[PDB]
Design a protein around this ligand. Structure first.
Ligand SMILES: [Zn+2]
Ligand SMILES: [Zn+2]
Length: 431
RNA sequence: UUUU
């Protein structure tokens, strides 16, 4: 029993780790690389897809699934286990990836084939391959997200997948992992903890009452998946004290995902589940409008406030969000609220530097609108949660993170008495 | 971590 990291090593994208045991070859996630590594999506897996016994998906995010369709494009035909939640989201995630890709390293035929081999595997459901026993654990990062517990050959391995930020309210608490011989964990925020949740919300509401009352615009760049609808959850449970204004979720993808949420209620927190029991959908606050096409989206740049806008991409790497910022970032009455991580080097970081006037889509636009960064809205376990989850495990191999962050976490792990390393590309570790 |  060994685990060979095949992505997300000293990096965050490309998450894919081949589990070798019981004579079987199980594949944990099969995500795509993003941004700078993008090209490497064309390069070879590093293993023979045809020799894989069965693959497990921790969640539907593209960086853990974006490459699956490639796997099949190259021969794989085995089973792909996930939660119904991951399965349903996944369809949306991929279909979009197709349209977004410049260099489509796969096609509709591959996606269709991939989705075809998806077989449901819910929490506490034990799968058996060879002498190997597998099971999903509650990770709380996305609806239906999980961490893997691989047990066999008298050894125990845990692959954390992505862990959630337990402070928030939509998803359930991530679960503590079982005591294992080896833990292959993520460390996206291995360097720092997050701003508390309570105070980021309070601050959020504050920015809202002030911007809306003066009749301005609240521009919220967002990811179409958990993030978009989670912001809506706040608007829904605080709408009573919030000033009346249309809430434009100007992102079709976010819609499709939102439309899908009432079918996944069991995948949320007890709180979210209680609301649904009362016959209500807490992901649709009053005044919500899902903007489907360009014309209406453009119209919003010219229309006056007060209004709240949600658009992607959550990293300003394009999307309608640009066109919004291009036109409302120059008015001081408008507010810009970042509710997710902005990659360094990107426009987000730039705008946050707060220069006199950023450039957006071939034109310099003055920057008067206020800017705010609510890192407390992060969907990832901050360093303090990472330490608590990992607490107790003897051995730990860190994947998913920038070497610096991973290192930072390791120092703490080491000083704590935990044998730890930084997974290297294609270099299986002894379970 | 994808966005007409
Ligand atoms: Zn994720
Ligand atoms: Zn991830």
């Amino acid at each position: 029993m060994r685990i060979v990291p095949f992505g997300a090593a000293r990096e965050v994208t490309g998450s894919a780790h081949l589990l070798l045991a019981g004579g079987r070859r199980v594949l944990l996630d099969c995500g795509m690389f993003q941004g700078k590594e993008e090209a490497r999506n064309h390069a070879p897996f590093g293993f023979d897809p045809k020799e894989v016994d069965a693959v497990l998906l921790t969640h539907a995010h593209l960086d853990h699934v974006g490459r699956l369709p490639k796997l099949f494009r190259e021969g794989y035909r085995g089973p792909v286990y996930a939660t119904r939640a991951t399965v349903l989201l996944m369809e949306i995630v991929l279909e979009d990836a197709l349209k977004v890709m410049d260099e489509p390293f796969f096609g509709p035929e591959d996606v269709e084939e991939a989705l075809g081999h998806l077989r449901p595997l819910e929490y506490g459901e034990w799968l058996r391959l060879g002498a190997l026993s597998l099971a999903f654990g509650q990770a709380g990062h996305l609806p239906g997200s999980a961490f893997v517990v691989a047990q066999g050959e008298g050894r125990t391995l845990v692959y954390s997948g992505d862990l959630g930020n337990r402070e928030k309210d939509v998803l359930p608490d991530p679960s503590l992992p079982p005591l294992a011989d080896l833990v292959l964990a993520e460390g996206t925020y291995g360097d720092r903890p997050h701003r508390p949740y309570r105070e980021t919300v309070r601050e959020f509401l504050e920015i809202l009452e002030k911007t809306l009352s003066q009749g301005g615009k609240v521009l919220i760049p967002t990811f179409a998946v958990e993030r978009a609808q989670e912001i809506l959850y706040v608007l829904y449970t605080h709408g009573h004290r919030l000033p009346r204004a249309p809430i434009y979720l100007d992102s079709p993808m976010a819609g499709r995902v939102l439309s899908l949420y009432p079918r996944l209620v069991r995948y949320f927190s007890e709180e979210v589940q209680a609301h649904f029991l009362q016959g209500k959908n807490p992901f649709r606050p009053a005044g919500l409008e899902v903007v489907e096409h360009t014309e209406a989206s453009k119209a919003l740049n010219r229309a006056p406030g007060p209004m709240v806008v949600l658009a992607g991409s959550g990293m300003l790497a394009g999307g309608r969000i640009l066109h919004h910022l291009k036109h409302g970032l120059s008015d001081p009455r408008n507010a810009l609220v970042f509710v997710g991580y902005q990659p360094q080097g990107g426009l987000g970081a730039e705008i946050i530097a707060r220069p006199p006037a950023v450039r957006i889509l071939g034109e310099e636009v003055p920057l008067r609108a206020s800017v705010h960064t609510l890192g407390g809205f992060s969907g990832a376990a901050g360093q303090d949660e990472l330490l608590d989850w990992l607490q107790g495990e003897p051995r730990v191999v860190l994947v998913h993170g920038e070497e610096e962050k991973l290192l930072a976490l390791g120092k703490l792990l080491a000083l704590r008495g935990q044998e730890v390393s930084l997974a290297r590309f294609g270099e299986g570790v002894p379970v």
